[PDB]
Each structure stands twice: as structure tokens, then as C-alpha cells.
């Protein structure tokens, strides 16, 4: 565990993270995909061996000794708001179990279902709150990766609000 478990946010490519493992915003089929998933595929392609897993779950595959936790958020184009919200919360709960199982002291996480799976909506607060619900009971340092300057400021504010 981290000596003083923290949350941080950085505005940069999660494929360049400084943590002991990474969460991929995966698709259910283990395909290279788009956005975060395509960056993770370019950096750790070996971790897509048998990475297919259902919505609301996480599946870890090692790239060398570096764990890639493939977390499948719901596509809100397909899910109802209610069922989508349930599956998004479940995906993060499965990430917390994997981060714990791995015994890592840090993890790089993206906001699940906030990009092409957002169904055209701003889901920063929804996704981040599910992330906190799952990760608060873990003792890994969590480093959230985003690309938008306004999202960086809002995520940082939400972290600071609790401190
Ligand atoms: Cl970058
Ligand atoms: Cl997404
Ligand atoms: Cl973003």
C-alpha cells in the first residue's frame, strides 16, 4: 500500500503513466478500439491476449510484468441511463478488486464511459463519483488521466473538496 494513499489528476496520455499498473478503458471484445484503448494497445499490445470481458467487469493481462486492467464501461448509446449507471459503478468495483489483488502501490485510471461511450453526455461527475466509491477503500495511490484542461481543473477541484 501507499504510505499516505492519495488521489491526483494529470492531463497527459495514460500510456505515459508513472504508476505500477494501468486501467484500460476497454471494449468488451479486446479490440484495439479508439481513444485511451488505442493508446493502451499501441503501448502494451501483448496485454490484449484474451482480454475480452463483459460490460461491468475488469480483466487483467500482464505485459511483461506490467499489469493492464481492462475495465469495460457501458456504452450509454446502448444502455438506459439506469442500467448504464449500474454497469459503470460495477466496472469500477471490479477495478478496485484487481488493484487490491495485484498488491500494487499505485494505479493510473481514466474516467470510464466519458469518451465515445458517453452517449454524447458530460459524465465527468458520474464517472468520477463511481471511481471514488470503488477506490476509496483501496490503499493504492490513484492517478487519474484526462486530456481536457477544463476536465483537469474540475477533477482536481473534486479531489481537493474532500481533503
Ligand atoms: Cl502526453
Ligand atoms: Cl469511453
Ligand atoms: Cl478528458
Curated annotation (Swiss-Prot):
Reported impact of residue 27 to R/Y: Almost complete loss of mono-ADP-ribosylhydrolase activity
Mutagenesis / variant outcome for changing residue 27 to A: Partial loss of mono-ADP-ribosylhydrolase activity; complete loss of ADP-ribose 1'' phosphate phosphatase activity
Post-translational changes noted in the entry: Phosphorylated by host on serines and threonines.
Consequence recorded when altering residue 36 to A: Partial loss of mono-ADP-ribosylhydrolase activity
Positions annotated to bind ADP-D-ribose: 13, 27, 35, 115-117
Membrane topology summary: Peripheral membrane protein
Superkingdom assignment: Viruses
Chain ranges of the Macro domain: 4-163
Entry's localization field: Host cytoplasmic vesicle membrane
Record comment regarding domains: In the N-terminus, the macro domain displays a mono-ADP-ribosylhydrolase activity. The central part called, the alphavirus unique domain (AUD) has a zinc-binding function. The C-terminus region, also called hypervariable domain (HVD), is mainly disordered and binds several host proteins. This intrinsically disordered domain contains 2 SH3 domain-binding sites and 2 FGDF motifs necessary and sufficient for the formation of nsP3/G3BP complexes.
Assembly with partners or alone: Interacts with mRNA-capping enzyme nsP1. Interacts (via C-terminus) with host G3BP1; this interaction inhibits the formation of host stress granules on viral mRNAs and the nsp3-G3BP1 complexes bind viral RNAs and probably orchestrate the assembly of viral replication complexes. Interacts (via C-terminus) with host G3BP2; this interaction inhibits the formation of host stress granules on viral mRNAs and the nsp3-G3BP2 complexes bind viral RNAs and probably orchestrate the assembly of viral replication complexes. Interacts (via C-terminus) with host NAP1L1.
Function text: Seems to be essential for minus-strand RNAs and subgenomic 26S mRNAs synthesis. Displays mono-ADP-ribosylhydrolase activity. ADP-ribosylation is a post-translational modification that controls various processes of the host cell and the virus probably needs to revert it for optimal viral replication. Binds proteins of G3BP family and sequesters them into the viral RNA replication complexes thereby inhibiting the formation of host stress granules on viral mRNAs.
Protein name: Non-structural protein 3
The organism of origin for this protein: Chikungunya virus (strain S27-African prototype) (CHIKV)
Source taxonomy: Viruses, Riboviria, Orthornavirae, Kitrinoviricota, Alsuviricetes
Range covered out of full length: 1334 to 1493 of 2474
Amino acid at each position: 500500500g501507499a504510505m499516505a494513499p492519495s488521489y491526483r489528476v494529470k492531463r497527459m496520455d495514460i500510456a505515459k503513466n508513472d504508476e505500477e499498473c494501468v486501467v484500460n478503458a476497454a471494449n468488451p471484445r479486446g479490440l484495439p478500439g479508439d481513444g485511451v484503448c488505442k493508446a493502451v494497445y499501441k503501448k502494451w499490445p501483448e496485454s490484449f491476449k484474451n482480454s475480452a470481458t463483459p460490460v461491468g467487469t475488469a480483466k487483467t493481462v500482464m505485459c511483461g510484468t506490467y499489469p493492464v486492467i481492462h475495465a469495460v464501461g457501458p456504452n450509454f448509446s446502448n444502455y438506459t441511463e439506469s442500467e448504464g449507471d449500474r454497469e459503470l459503478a460495477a466496472a469500477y468495483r471490479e477495478v478496485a478488486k484487481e488493484v487490491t489483488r495485484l498488491g500494487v502501490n499505485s494505479v493510473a485510471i481514466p474516467l470510464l464511459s466519458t469518451g465515445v461511450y458517453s452517449g454524447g453526455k458530460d459524465r465527468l461527475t458520474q464517472s468520477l463519483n463511481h471511481l471514488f466509491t470503488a477506490m476509496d477503500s483501496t490503499d493504492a495511490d490513484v492517478v487519474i488521466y484526462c486530456r481536457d484542461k477544463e476536465w483537469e481543473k474540475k477533477i482536481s477541484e473534486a479531489i481537493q473538496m474532500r481533503t
